Design a protein around this ligand. Structure first.
Ligand SMILES: C/C(=C\c1csc(C)n1)[C@@H]1C[C@@H]2O[C@@H]2CCC[C@H](C)[C@H](O)[C@@H](C)C(=O)C(C)(C)[C@@H](O)CC(=O)O1
Ligand SMILES: Nc1nc2c(ncn2[C@@H]2O[C@H](COP(=O)(O)OP(=O)(O)OP(=O)(O)O)[C@@H](O)[C@H]2O)c(=O)[nH]1
Ligand SMILES: Nc1nc2c(ncn2[C@@H]2O[C@H](COP(=O)(O)OP(=O)(O)O)[C@@H](O)[C@H]2O)c(=O)[nH]1
Lengths: 427, 440
């Protein structure tokens, strides 16, 4: 479990991937031309996790950027950071999917498929020991949802024992930009629950709320939100590329966070967050970071965490942190707020520590919670879906590509089953 | 006896082993390059201390008898780049390319068995070199993936191969209150099933209690895993001190087993280290034998979260180091017996075995433990230990009722009846412990 393969899908997935790779290069001290700037033993040894060393010391990331719209990939190739990527890992077709999950899943998605699988096989052969796959896409698109789910199915078919960790961008309950997004999202979750090992749910509205509320922003941009997501991604894999006291792994995340195969969905949170210029008025303390992480405003999913109940929690600290401090504050949160923690599982939360600090701060922490509150989101979309499917509106766009109403009914039934199971364990 | 081999499994076990070997090198005066400089001869840096662990190779360089096993390569890489990378043979460090998560099933039944043959061969070669092997010394994390699974598997295989060698196990137990692993009780129960049938003597340390000692006795504001490991290492060193140096009453490991183990089971003593004195308070202390003995039985100086006053003491062994009079020690033990809180069981007329070693204790620079002219280690069998097991069992039951994380273990080649069997065996062990310890 050394080498990780990154796969970005769609407009959103590709943009997030760009931000993520920028962050990783900044952490490891890599120039955007592929030649490393700094190499320190903590940075230099574990370069093999995300990067292959090409001849003449130029480092290239193991990454696959896929979409059906050439313009996004053109813009990526003409950006600074366009050099880092080996040109063979960009794969795109001419005709997009609009926003239709059916086109990207079989009809117009089959235009690529095999090429992506071939480059995946080449990357797999080039790695000593595969660890898992990171798949960045947007639920509720045409390309990111359909082609993404199809690709996940193929990858798990060929590599069944490798970890599939998907970062999904969900619909927002307040004013989404796409009309038929519910159809796509439901269709996508149908496959996602059968293939993905762990899926981190994020929605843009919660990110915007963080931007304006805690950070007092004037007009945020997508790249700003993508930076938050990239920071969370970095935080997850920190223990793989760096030493520490309590190290963690993707399989370990799954074991600690997954009581039942049907609960792999997670909320994420990040600390600290302080608006510009008030940085001087802050103290970085493990208690303060814990307070930030359990604050409902710092959830990146639009569910109310106080409404549900926490099954399993995994916290990850970076920088100057005592294990004893983390144990103390964690147990204080467990005892004080014990109404939010399920009594069926005595150990509600587990901790990990990494000595390396994120750039710009002496201390920071990422928060992964498996809570029943996530059901709320599943309900909302579900309602919307059912409503539109009652009138069979927009259905002709889907059924013209070979879809059947039976598939939609099956997907809604699966969603209802998920919500029912989360209710069962909420108890 | 002559030689003892140390075996470290998992992140925690390997870190503890690092601290222990650092401490041994300090006591014997061995350079981080593996050199007898720092004093070259006599029991500190001499054949007395060199036998038992360190093995003299060509050019007078000393390589410890130590075996590091981790399924996670990062820990052993970190050791390979540290200052003590020089001390040991590079082939004694064995690194796997996949973790066990915290899953006892992968370390025992799948990923751990891939390394098992290699580490067994290494143990066999080292054992061949050993002239007069006494036994083995195990460093575990009970409740982890590698320590639990690989530790139990390796221990069983080693017992099958040798079988008349003394097998010591120093295990780091789950915490009654604040723990870092969601499935830890599953692993712990599963491992105890094997540990009860293989390990000859098991020492248990709860990290919560050591943290309490660091914050209260040593008044350490921000303790680290390293300081905890230093304390534990001092305990182990004092266990082997009677083997490495001359004294009045020289205790062996077989003597420990004899006096502390009345029946085949009930091999799980608690450990305590009395002179834990802050360097700030170093000049306000007497260091009297009676005072140190009183500190031993103080719960604040115990290394497990268990109340020894709640139970009955079956048998204990004190181990004194430094300048100590035998008569003074005897008088202190008699006073402790007269306290009546010991609650000595009826079978034991004394139940207090005293070792005395004429070498003074030393401490690593990173700790607030000041140098003292005498020290004590306390190994006690008490009924109160059952409490810990009960705690673990309860945490097991609540999960196992819903089969909480079972699928992670079952997918790796485990059976549900195995869980039922291990839990049943633990319950039987607790029941017999209470049964004998009450009416002994
Ligand atoms: C600098 C930050 C926190 C902080 C510094 S000192 C302290 C106690 N907290 C965090 C860092 C997080 O990675 C996130 C960046 C988020 C950026 C915003 C979404 C937005 O783009 C930006 C314009 C902002 O609003 C801030 C510049 C105020 C940003 O500092 C917000 C913040 O706290 O970020
Ligand atoms: N005393 C001590 N305990 C530790 C240390 N590191 C971890 N622990 C404890 O051991 C348990 C954690 O086990 P892990 O370190 O995650 O794992 P492991 O048993 O070494 O096995 P792997 O998971 O395969 O690495 C918890 O009880 C920790 O508090 C350490 O350096 N010292
Ligand atoms: N966080 C984030 N969300 C994005 C980004 N681009 C699009 N989205 C979201 O993705 C959805 C639109 O789908 P889209 O990216 O057009 O899908 P595609 O047609 O497959 O490329 C809506 O939820 C958008 O808000 C981006 O750069 N970042």
């Amino acid at each position: 479990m050394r080498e990780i393969i990154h796969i970005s899908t769609g407009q959103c997935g590709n943009q997030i991937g760009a931000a993520f790779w920028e962050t990783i290069c900044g952490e490891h001290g890599l120039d955007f031309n592929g030649t490393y700037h700094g190499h320190d033993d903590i940075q230099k040894e574990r370069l093999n996790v995300y990067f292959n060393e090409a001849s003449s010391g130029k480092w290239v990331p193991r990454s696959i950027n896929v979409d059906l719209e050439p313009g996004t990939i053109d813009a990526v190739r003409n950006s600074a950071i366009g050099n880092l990527f080996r040109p063979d890992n960009y794969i795109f077709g001419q005709s997009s999917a609009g926003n239709v999950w059916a086109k990207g899943h079989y009809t117009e998605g089959a235009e690529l498929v095999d090429s992506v699988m071939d480059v995946i096989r080449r990357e797999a052969e080039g790695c000593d020991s595969l660890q898992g796959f990171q798949i960045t896409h947007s639920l509720g698109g045409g390309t990111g949802s359909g082609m993404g789910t199809l690709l996940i199915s193929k990858i798990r078919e060929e590599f069944p024992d490798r970890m599939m960790a998907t970062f999904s961008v969900l619909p927002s309950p307040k004013t989404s930009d796409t009309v038929v997004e519910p159809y796509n999202a439901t269709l996508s979750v149908h496959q996602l629950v059968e293939h993905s090992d762990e899926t981190f749910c994020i929605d843009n509205e919660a990110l915007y709320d963080i931007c304006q509320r805690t950070l007092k922003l004037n007009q945020p941009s997508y790249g700003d939100l993508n930076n938050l997501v990239s920071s969370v991604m970095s935080g997850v894999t920190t223990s793989l590329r760096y030493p520490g006291q309590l190290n963690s792994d993707l399989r370990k995340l799954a074991v600690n966070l997954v009581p039942f195969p049907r609960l792999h969905f997670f909320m994420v949170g990040y600390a600290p967050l302080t608006a510009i210029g008030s940085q001087s008025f802050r103290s970085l303390t493990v208690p303060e970071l814990t307070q930030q992480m359990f604050d409902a405003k710092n959830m990146m999913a639009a569910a109310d965490p106080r409404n549900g109940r926490y099954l399993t929690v995994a916290a990850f600290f970076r920088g100057k942190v005592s294990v004893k401090e983390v144990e103390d504050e964690m147990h204080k949160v467990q005892s004080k707020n014990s109404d939010y923690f399920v009594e069926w599982i005595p150990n509600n939360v587990q901790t990990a520590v990494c000595s390396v600090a994120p750039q710009g701060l002496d201390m920071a922490a990422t928060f992964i919670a498996n809570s029943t509150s996530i059901q709320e989101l599943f309900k909302r979309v579900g309602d919307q879906f059912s409503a539109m499917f009652k009138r069979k509106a927009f259905l002709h766009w889907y059924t013209s590509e070979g879809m059947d109403e039976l598939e939609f009914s099956e997907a809604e039934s699966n969603m209802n089953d998920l919500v029912s199971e989360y209710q069962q364990y909420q108890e | 006896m002559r030689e003892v081999i140390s075996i470290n499994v998992g992140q925690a076990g390997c870190q503890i082993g690092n601290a222990c070997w650092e401490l041994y090198s300090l006591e014997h005066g061995i350079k981080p390059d593996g050199h007898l400089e720092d004093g070259l001869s006599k029991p500190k840096g001499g054949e007395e201390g060199f036998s038992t662990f360190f093995h003299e190779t060509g050019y007078g360089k000393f390589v410890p008898r130590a075996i590091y096993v981790d399924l996670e390569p990062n820990v052993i890489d970190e050791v390979r780049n540290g200052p003590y990378k020089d001390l040991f043979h590079p082939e004694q460090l064995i690194s796997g390319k996949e973790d066990a998560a915290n899953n006892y099933a992968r370390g025992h039944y799948t990923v751990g068995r891939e390394i098992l043959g290699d580490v067994l061969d290494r143990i066999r070669k080292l054992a061949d070199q050993c002239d007069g092997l006494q036994g083995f010394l195990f460093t575990h994390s009970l409740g982890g993936g590698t320590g639990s699974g690989l530790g139990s598997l390796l221990l069983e295989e080693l017992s099958a191969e040798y079988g008349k060698k003394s097998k010591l196990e120093f295990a780091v137990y789950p915490a009654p209150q604040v723990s870092t692993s969601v499935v830890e009780p599953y692993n712990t129960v599963l491992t105890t099933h094997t540990t009860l049938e293989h390990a000859d003597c098991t020492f248990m340390v709860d990290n919560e209690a050591i943290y309490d000692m660091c914050k209260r006795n040593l008044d350490i504001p921000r303790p680290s895993f390293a300081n905890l490991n230093n304390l534990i290492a001092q305990v182990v060193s004092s266990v082997t001190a009677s083997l490495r140096f001359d004294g009045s009453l020289n205790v062996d490991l077989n003597e420990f087993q004899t006096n502390l183990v009345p029946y085949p089971r009930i091999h799980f003593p608690l450990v305590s280290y009395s002179p834990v004195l802050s360097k700030s308070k170093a000049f306000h202390e007497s260091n009297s034998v009676s005072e140190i003995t009183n500190a031993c039985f103080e719960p604040g100086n115990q290394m497990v979260k268990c109340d020894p006053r709640d139970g009955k003491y079956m048998a204990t062994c004190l181990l004194y180091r430094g300048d100590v009079v035998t008569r003074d020690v005897q008088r202190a033990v008699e006073q402790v017996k007269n306290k009546k809180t010991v609650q000595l069981v009826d079978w034991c007329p004394t139940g207090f075995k005293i070792g005395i070693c004429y070498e003074p204790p030393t401490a690593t620079p990173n700790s607030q433990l000041a140098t003292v002219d005498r020290a004590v280690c306390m190994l006690s069998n008490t009924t109160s230990i059952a409490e810990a097991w009960k705690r673990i069992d309860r945490k097991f039951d609540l999960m196992y009722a819903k089969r909480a994380f079972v699928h992670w273990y079952v997918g790796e080649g485990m059976e549900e009846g195995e869980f039922t069997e291990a839990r049943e065996d633990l319950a039987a062990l607790e029941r017999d412990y209470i049964e004998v310890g009450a009416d002994s």
